[PDB]
């Protein structure tokens, strides 16, 4: 179990940690989150009471350092920082627990939700998508653009998702135009898996990171990335059987965790009807199909 202390809570904010969240009041005695499970990535995020625009947050892994939160009144936002002085840090953490001013990461023991949403998310791959190598944690917010979006403007603040483009030379072998566009198998398996991602777990990890960014920040470009990576599999006639089964699990938990009221902007009607009903893989997402039909029949 790990702890992320907060120096203070100067402004009213809804704090999220993974899929959980809490309301904290302006200058309420709040000094962090304890009992955070080691072994997974985590995301601590914020929404000020005074600005329902811009959700922001920090992805992190407790095994990579001692991290804490401190409000910055010049920049006006909660910042994540690393404490290098292990003694000083256990000392702050210990005193705040003694004074019981910390909330407990509220995990039900039956629940694998967070594991299932992050199975393949690695902190090291996150740090290549959110390039900022002076820090061990990664900032994301609602407004950050992706690289592909920047091609159609500040690169330091870009989400460097792997670029997928179905109408591109990369995706289409000369001479196999019709074949490669109707059956993306070569683009998925040779170009993307073997070539760029190296294996399905990196692909999956980026797919899951994309979703969570869409979900926790409403990041539009992440939503785009997530649907593209689903679409690329569903439109491939030849997919490793282990990938299809794991994809159905991954999507199931994503759809299951999505807030009901956000299904309109966060689910792309076309991609889903194609994956579930038209594509090669229409019959291979049994769990995902069933939860989509019983929870969002309108969308289909």
């Amino acid at each position: 179990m790990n702890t992320v202390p907060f120096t203070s809570a100067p402004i009213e904010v809804t704090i999220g940690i993974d899929q959980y969240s809490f309301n904290v009041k302006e200058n309420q005695p709040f000094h962090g989150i304890k009992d955070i499970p080691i072994g997974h990535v985590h995301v601590i995020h914020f929404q000020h009471a005074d600005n329902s625009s811009m959700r922001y947050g920090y992805w992190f892994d407790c095994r990579m350092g001692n991290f804490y939160i401190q409000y910055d009144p010049k920049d006006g936002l909660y910042k994540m920082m690393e404490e290098r002085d292990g003694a000083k840090f256990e000392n702050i953490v210990h005193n705040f627990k003694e004074r019981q001013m910390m909330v407990s990461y509220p995990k039900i023991d039956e629940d694998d939700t967070w594991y299932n949403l992050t199975e393949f998310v690695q902190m090291d791959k996150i740090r290549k998508i959110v390039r900022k190598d002076e820090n061990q944690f990664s900032y994301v917010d609602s407004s950050m653009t992706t690289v592909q979006e920047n091609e159609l403007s500040d690169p330091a603040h870009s989400l460097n998702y792997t670029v997928i483009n179905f109408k591109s030379r990369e995706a289409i072998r000369p001479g196999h135009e019709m074949e490669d566009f109707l059956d993306k198998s070569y683009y998925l398996n040779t170009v993307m898996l073997q070539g760029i991602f190296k294996n399905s777990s990196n692909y999956f990890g980026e797919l899951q990171f994309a979703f969570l960014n869409a979900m926790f920040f409403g990041n539009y470009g992440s939503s785009l990335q997530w649907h593209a990576m689903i679409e690329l599999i569903c439109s491939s006639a030849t997919v490793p059987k282990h990938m299809l089964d794991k994809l159905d699990e991954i999507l199931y938990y994503q759809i299951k965790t999505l807030p009901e009221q956000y299904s309109d902007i966060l689910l792309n009607e076309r991609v889903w009807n194609i994956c579930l009903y038209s594509s090669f893989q229409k019959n291979s997402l049994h769990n995902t199909e069933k939860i989509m039909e019983n929870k969002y029949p309108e969308l289909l």
């Binding site: 109408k167 591109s168 030379r169 289409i172 135009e177 019709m178 566009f181």
Partner: protein, 237 residues
């Protein structure tokens, strides 16, 4: 963007552009088999690729052999169209390659775009216009050369004959589409109008009769009247 009645005059500027109509690429007759099931028999088709400014027509004859042993042919026809259109661009000197290709049917956008990936600066565009290019095979000389073909073959025409020696491309294209519209709506009557007079012939290197200017007026008026008569009939108006 899409082409419609607003930006109609863009066709006749000096930006090279081609129209591509795929309606006659995959052509079948339907018939009954001995056991009473239905079966198709394909006949030769054509891609209709037209520069509306100059009248030049790149008629690519599509020989039935291309379908041999293929499935989902109506889908394949679109991909073969795009392949043949791409090769035509590639075969043309740079200064002659088009800046835009306008497909008459939106289903050709993806196939052409994918085949044109090597030419990212050629804009592939749909149209909302209802152009009558499917009636090209009502033009006797065009149908003749398609039906006689024994092999894939490219045949070149000027679909305006020599009209441009006397009229603008704007006017030439309005005549062409009026004639094709008439042919589309009532071919027998349209053809009757064009040929009633045996003393106005078609030059061997031409597609349409050698009408004088006054006679084109009468013909255009007769085609107009035909199209409106047939419209009343369709909608009992």
């Amino acid at each position: 963007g899409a082409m419609n009645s607003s930006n109609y005059a863009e066709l006749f500027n000096n930006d090279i552009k081609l129209f591509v109509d795929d309606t006659n690429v995959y052509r079948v007759t339907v018939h009954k088999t001995f056991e009473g099931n239905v079966a198709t028999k394909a006949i030769n088709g054509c891609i209709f690729t037209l520069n509306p400014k100059t009248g030049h027509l790149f008629l690519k004859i599509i020989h039935t052999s291309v379908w041999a042993g293929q499935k989902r042919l109506s889908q394949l026809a679109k991909w073969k169209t795009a392949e043949e259109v791409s090769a035509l661009v590639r075969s043309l000197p740079k200064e002659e390659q088009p800046k835009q290709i306008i497909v008459t049917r939106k289903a050709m956008l993806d196939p052409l775009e994918v085949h044109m990936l090597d030419f990212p600066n050629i804009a592939i565009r749909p149209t909302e216009l209802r152009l009558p290019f499917s009636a090209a095979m009502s033009i006797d000389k065009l149908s003749d050369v398609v039906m006689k073909a024994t092999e894939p073959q490219m045949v070149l025409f000027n679909i305006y004959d020599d009209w441009l020696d006397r009229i603008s491309s704007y006017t030439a294209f309005s005549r062409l589409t009026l004639l094709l519209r008439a042919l589309k709506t009532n071919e027998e009557s349209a053809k009757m109008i064009l040929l009633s007079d045996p003393t106005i012939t078609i030059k061997s290197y031409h597609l349409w009769p050698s009408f004088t200017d006054e006679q084109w007026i009468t013909i255009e008026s007769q085609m107009r009247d035909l199209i409106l008569t047939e419209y009343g009939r369709k909608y009992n108006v």
